[PDB]
Amino acid sequence: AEIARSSVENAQMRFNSGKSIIVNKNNPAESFKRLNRIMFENNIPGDKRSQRFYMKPGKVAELKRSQRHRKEFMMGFKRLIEIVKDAKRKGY
């Protein structure tokens, strides 16, 4: 009945996937840029490419170890650059 007619709006958007954007009728190219940001913050393009071919578990583990090391190495590099900049500012 109408009870099943007036409660479909929330119901429709209650089962959201999180990969949708409400287009800005003024700047429609800014909504496509927002959608792209979601894809990259959920690694959707990377996951899709990584699922095209099978990789042996040993190789998967090696790549995961190396990637983590590079991430941590970059964080250690940036920490040292900040110290350099601070030291330079104070005249060291």
Binding site: I3, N10, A11, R14, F15
Partner: protein, 131 residues
């Protein structure tokens, strides 16, 4: 052992939303108390929209009445209850998690423990000493 059942009952009749849930709680409660078990609490959680459209016994669902039931029974009885829930067409999803009683005999439901109330005595003593 203390167990915490969370069941998602089907809401077939929009006029009587809390009908199958009441009928189901009575069935489960009777199994527990008729097999040397104790029912410690029954916390209704209300009608909620399912995270997705779910299926059960060749039927689809978009909403369900959520309810929690904290009960004490033996492992054999707990498995019997789970078997009946997994077969009942009314139940869409059912989970039974053990609540450890090694350190204290009186534990509240996870919902209540999340709010800081660790024991049922704390809940009752906040309904008598302050209500």
């Amino acid at each position: 052992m203390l167990y915490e059942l969370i069941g998602l009952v089907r809401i077939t009749n929009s006029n009587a939303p809390k009908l199958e849930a009441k009928e189901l709680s009575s069935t489960i409660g009777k199994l527990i108390i008729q097999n040397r078990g104790v029912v410690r609490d029954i916390v209704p959680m209300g009608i909620r929209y399912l995270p997705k459209i779910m299926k059960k016994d060749q039927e689809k669902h978009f909403r369900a009445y959520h309810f929690l039931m904290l009960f004490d029974s033996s492992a054999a009885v707990q498995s019997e209850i789970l078997r009946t829930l997994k077969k009942d067409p009314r139940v869409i999803r059912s989970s039974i998690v053990k609540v450890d009683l090694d350190k204290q005999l009186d534990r509240a439901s996870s919902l209540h423990r999340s709010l800081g109330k660790k024991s049922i005595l704390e809940l009752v003593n906040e309904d008598y000493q302050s209500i």
